[PDB]
Amino acid sequence: MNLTELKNTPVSELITLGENMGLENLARMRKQDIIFAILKQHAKSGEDIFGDGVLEILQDGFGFLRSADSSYLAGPDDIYVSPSQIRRFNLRTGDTISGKIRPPKEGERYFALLKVNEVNFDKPENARNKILFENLTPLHANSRLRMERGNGSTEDLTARVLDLASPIGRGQRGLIVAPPKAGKTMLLQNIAQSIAYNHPDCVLMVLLIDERPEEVTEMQRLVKGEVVASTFDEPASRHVQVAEMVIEKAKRLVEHKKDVIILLDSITRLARAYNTVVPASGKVLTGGVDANALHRPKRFFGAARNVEEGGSLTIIATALIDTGSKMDEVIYEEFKGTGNMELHLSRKIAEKRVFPAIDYNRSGTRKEELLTTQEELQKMWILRKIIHPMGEIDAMEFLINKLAMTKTNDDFFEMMK
Amino acid sequence: MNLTELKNTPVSELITLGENMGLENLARMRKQDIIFAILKQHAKSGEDIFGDGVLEILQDGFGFLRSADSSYLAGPDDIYVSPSQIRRFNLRTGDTISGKIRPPKEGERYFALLKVNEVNFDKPENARNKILFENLTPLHANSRLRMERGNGSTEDLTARVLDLASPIGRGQRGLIVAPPKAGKTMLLQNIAQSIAYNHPDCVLMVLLIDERPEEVTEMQRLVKGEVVASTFDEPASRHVQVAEMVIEKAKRLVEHKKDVIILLDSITRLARAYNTVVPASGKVLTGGVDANALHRPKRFFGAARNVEEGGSLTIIATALIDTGSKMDEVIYEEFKGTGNMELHLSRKIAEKRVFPAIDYNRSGTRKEELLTTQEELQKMWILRKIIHPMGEIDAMEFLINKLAMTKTNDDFFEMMK
Amino acid sequence: LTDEEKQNQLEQLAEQYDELKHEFEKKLEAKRRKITQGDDLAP
RNA sequence: CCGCACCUCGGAGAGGUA
Structure with a gap:
């Protein structure tokens, strides 16, 4: 149950799934609130929750895993990255972090990251x-x-x-x-x-x-x-x-x-x-x-x-x-x-x-x-020496009329000789 | 007994109605106070009062229903909106609210919203x-x-x-x-x-x-x-x-x-x-x-x-x-x-x-x-190519003299060709 | 579920919610004010 | 904190304890 996959689905399917699960009225709720509620309900059954995103380290030391579809806009529903894991795995801003996540407990506002499984869409051993x-x-x-x-x-x-x-x-x-x-x-x-x-x-x-x-x-x-x-x-x-x-x-x-x-x-x-x-x-x-x-x-x-x-x-x-x-x-x-x-x-x-x-x-x-190549450079030099005396509009018209005769520039180069 | 119907009647008719009802001397009272006293006396008999206005939620949590005849200006007769109604109907700044309004009781200064009948000139179910x-x-x-x-x-x-x-x-x-x-x-x-x-x-x-x-x-x-x-x-x-x-x-x-x-x-x-x-x-x-x-x-x-x-x-x-x-x-x-x-x-x-x-x-x-259309775009291109070499005043005079000959631009375009 | 007072109780639901407002939730708002409003103290 | 724009520490009353 990835976060990006659930954020890419339309609102209609999310409301349908939330009504099938048996939650409160989701029509007047935000898509992010629907995602949060369905994640809580899915974690209540015992299944694990997974997410991903690019790390955005703040000045205080901690960072978050933002999404690319929102231009990495700051949001209250993202994967929190504690400074402990940053010091442990030597994480920096820009590292694509994918791993297991969990719903926030009482008193928290962001999803905590437990273990990182994939770094920069590659093995963590090659990324460290x-x-x-x-x-x-x-x-x-x-x-x-x-x-x-x-x-x-x-x-x-x-x-x-x-x-x-x-x-x-x-x-x-x-x-x-x-x-x-x-x-x-x-x-x-x-x-x-x-x-x-x-x-x-x-x-x-x-x-x-x-x-x-x-x-x-x-x-x-x-x-x-x-x-x-x-x-x-x-x-x-x-x-x-x-x-x-x-x-x-x-x-x-x-x-x-x-x-x-x-x-x-x-x-x-x-x-x-x-x-x-x-x-x-x-x-x-x-x-x-x-x-x-x-x-x-x-x-x-x-x-x-x-x-x-x-x-x-x-x-x-x-x-x-x-x-x-x-x-x-x-x-x-x-x-x-x-x-x-x-x-x-x-x-x-x-x-x-x-x-x-x-x-x-x-x-x-x-x-x-x-x-x-050498011959390509020589042909470009000859073309520039022939085109330079003419005016800009005339040069463009000449180039268009010459390129329109064939499909590839190789035929033009062969015909110029 | 609608708010919009009462906020448009002249002063003479309101004074006459208030003197017939038997209220305080209305010749030395403002129109807003006259309407307020008339609504109070009408509600004391057991009649319903209707109101409407655009919602303006303040920073403290509550809001008021501004009127459209004063360019959304804070008035003494603005309708008060309790935060409980905002939490119930998920109200936001800009939501037009229309419905029965109760007069202010002892200790109040603004009208309360009894029940909302129309939301944004539409049914509440479609607006929620x-x-x-x-x-x-x-x-x-x-x-x-x-x-x-x-x-x-x-x-x-x-x-x-x-x-x-x-x-x-x-x-x-x-x-x-x-x-x-x-x-x-x-x-x-x-x-x-x-x-x-x-x-x-x-x-x-x-x-x-x-x-x-x-x-x-x-x-x-x-x-x-x-x-x-x-x-x-x-x-x-x-x-x-x-x-x-x-x-x-x-x-x-x-x-x-x-x-x-x-x-x-x-x-x-x-x-x-x-x-x-x-x-x-x-x-x-x-x-x-x-x-x-x-x-x-x-x-x-x-x-x-x-x-x-x-x-x-x-x-x-x-x-x-x-x-x-x-x-x-x-x-x-x-x-x-x-x-x-x-x-x-x-x-x-x-x-x-x-x-x-x-x-x-x-x-x-x-x-x-x-x-x-393509034809209209080509005609505009031709008109711009013809007008561009001329001066501003000369181009305007030419355009005026050309448009004076016909009624529609289609005839001018047909005659240009 | 049938042709009974439920048709009226749906409209009586709104009237009951308004009565509950008037008697309990308006008092809630009054208490919210009294907690938030200032207190008459010495000059 | 004064103006954005490059040519040669008190008084009265009430109650109580020994």
């Missing part, structure tokens, strides 16, 4: 003895993540243009610079779909912080993966906590030799949240940015790196420019000198309804020879 | 078993709210321009950006009249906060609907209370599967009121805004959403820019990145008395293909 992420030797992007579908679909044109302009690999740290109303949503959805289709082994993560609830419920019902979000109706502390939980889970997965790909579309929103929640230091920089406000997002961005011992962490954030606020401009100018990949989008091309409106001239990738 | 608003599945705007009258009146030109520039559907969350003296009053009155004329089934609410009493009495005596207002003669606490009551009533009506449309014209004034009533936290942002002052108006704005199970909540707020205060500019710049619809107005066009002075180039609607 491990090399920390701070000790992993970083490296440049070595493996290639080919975003091209190859099925000849019209949606694959965006992935083809992306692979021709900025090849992305495992451990890449890129930036998607674009003005508002450029098409970042559809482009990010296409990137997520291509990652889920071509690279299913990669752990795709979408973190939409401080966005509209309609866009959140659209993203959750469109892509095949995990979508942890935090709308603007929640305070900035919620955003900070969600980002911390996500980066801790990503670090734990990378330590467990997993290829995590994080698509962030709120780096500017996260920086604003950090600048809002930071105490008044007394020194304000140009644009209303605090001195210690850019530390946390810059570290979150730099966390992405390629691991030689195993696994990789790829983070492709999306920047916001020309938003009318000088603070966002200062944030973009500061974060520009940090990454090594910029995917610019042109508003002039977007106004002509030419999607995708990708600035091919200003795009590029540093050390691209480590992700492409 | 329901799903909360926080559990409803959000979606984008699906239903089309055509604002075109069709009667061929000269006032319909503004509605036609609004429909061509930015169509509005059920559940839309937009902003009406405009400088001072743009004419927001006439535009809001026209929108309210068009909503009351074309869509009488939807619940229309006009919320005015911190406005002049003349505009209030003009709005109440012009539109066919409910208008809750709060002039500047009241403190910001009254504004916050009115906003909370309005948003709770809207949430309850949405939970009861109703299409609520709120015409707010005080988002900036509401933010100022929240910043004034929030306790000082020792941290001041750019323009004099508290770090936690934007949370409440941001949630009030984001409460609007489209429900798939039933009902919808539309909130159209008007923002103030170029008011000489940097605080309003910061509030506008912060709230601009939240909504998905901006209807800007040009001061240059308003100075020439060319109404409506609407910035057609800066206007627009995101995901407009979900509320308009």
Whole structure:
């Protein structure tokens, strides 16, 4: 009787089960109260109760096992983790803990954890003895993540243009610079779909912080993966906590030799949240940015790196420019000198309804020879030297007319010769 | 003997009735005291007294039933709600309660609730078993709210321009950006009249906060609907209370599967009121805004959403820019990145008395293909491509001269081809 | 269960609950007030 | 705690104990 399985069932089936068990009227009771009552009734018979969740250690020492479907929102009905077990098993924030639980006794408000059975969806013996992420030797992007579908679909044109302009690999740290109303949503959805289709082994993560609830419920019902979000109706502390939980889970997965790909579309929103929640230091920089406000997002961005011992962490954030606020401009100018990949989008091309409106001239990738072969690099260099003299709109039209003739870029490369 | 029927009769008839009953001299008594004494004398004979009102639960545990004729203002004749009834019926702030009320006994100052007959204009059995608003599945705007009258009146030109520039559907969350003296009053009155004329089934609410009493009495005596207002003669606490009551009533009506449309014209004034009533936290942002002052108006704005199970909540707020205060500019710049619809107005066009002075180039609607057909979308694209090269005043004059030739936009679209 | 006073007792259930309110639960609220309200003391 | 925004420690009465 897992907690997640009981939380995923609809309210109707829960009310039906509660009426069959013979409890009080559950129609006017909350779903969480129904779950609590049915867990008490099931434990009264003598059966054991099991649960799971990601650990969220508080400042006082203890922590809880939050759920992913609620963006790790603080709730009164979760698995309490005593500091004793934390000191015993050396648990940290982000460790996925699964084990036996029990209903709280009189005077308690949370489910107590007795014994942990599975750590990070793996054996506890392999999770206790491990090399920390701070000790992993970083490296440049070595493996290639080919975003091209190859099925000849019209949606694959965006992935083809992306692979021709900025090849992305495992451990890449890129930036998607674009003005508002450029098409970042559809482009990010296409990137997520291509990652889920071509690279299913990669752990795709979408973190939409401080966005509209309609866009959140659209993203959750469109892509095949995990979508942890935090709308603007929640305070900035919620955003900070969600980002911390996500980066801790990503670090734990990378330590467990997993290829995590994080698509962030709120780096500017996260920086604003950090600048809002930071105490008044007394020194304000140009644009209303605090001195210690850019530390946390810059570290979150730099966390992405390629691991030689195993696994990789790829983070492709999306920047916001020309938003009318000088603070966002200062944030973009500061974060520009940090990454090594910029995917610019042109508003002039977007106004002509030419999607995708990708600035091919200003795009590029540093050390691209480590992700492409010699002949592929030579062909890309020749294509750039031929395209550069033409204008942005003309270059995009030429590229679309050339890619529309065939399905794969290999045929275009063979015909160019 | 209903409360709403007694709170609308003139003073002369109430004085006559009280002199016929044989009570104290009513010529030197207020209308509320007259009604109170008449109800007391009527109940002393053995008759029933009926009442109604919107519930407002206080922090101490109890609540009162505010009336709709005083814009939800604390009055001496408010109906008291005991906490026992709240525990029995699971009452919450916003639940409309209607039923028999008993007069206050010796030692009491407010009417008690004898029995509740109707809950939220519906049967109590249907209102006691329901799903909360926080559990409803959000979606984008699906239903089309055509604002075109069709009667061929000269006032319909503004509605036609609004429909061509930015169509509005059920559940839309937009902003009406405009400088001072743009004419927001006439535009809001026209929108309210068009909503009351074309869509009488939807619940229309006009919320005015911190406005002049003349505009209030003009709005109440012009539109066919409910208008809750709060002039500047009241403190910001009254504004916050009115906003909370309005948003709770809207949430309850949405939970009861109703299409609520709120015409707010005080988002900036509401933010100022929240910043004034929030306790000082020792941290001041750019323009004099508290770090936690934007949370409440941001949630009030984001409460609007489209429900798939039933009902919808539309909130159209008007923002103030170029008011000489940097605080309003910061509030506008912060709230601009939240909504998905901006209807800007040009001061240059308003100075020439060319109404409506609407910035057609800066206007627009995101995901407009979900509320308009393919043919209509293509016609709007062609109209925007033709209008964009021209100047603002020139484009407005061209649009007026083109709409003056026909009655409906369909004939104009057919003649353009 | 049949055509008996039970049809009235369902409506008499509400009347009995109102009488119980008036005589016991209104006194409960009065006691709650008297416990929560202040006490007349020396100036 | 004064203003957010980068060009060359007392008195009376009542009851009781020895």
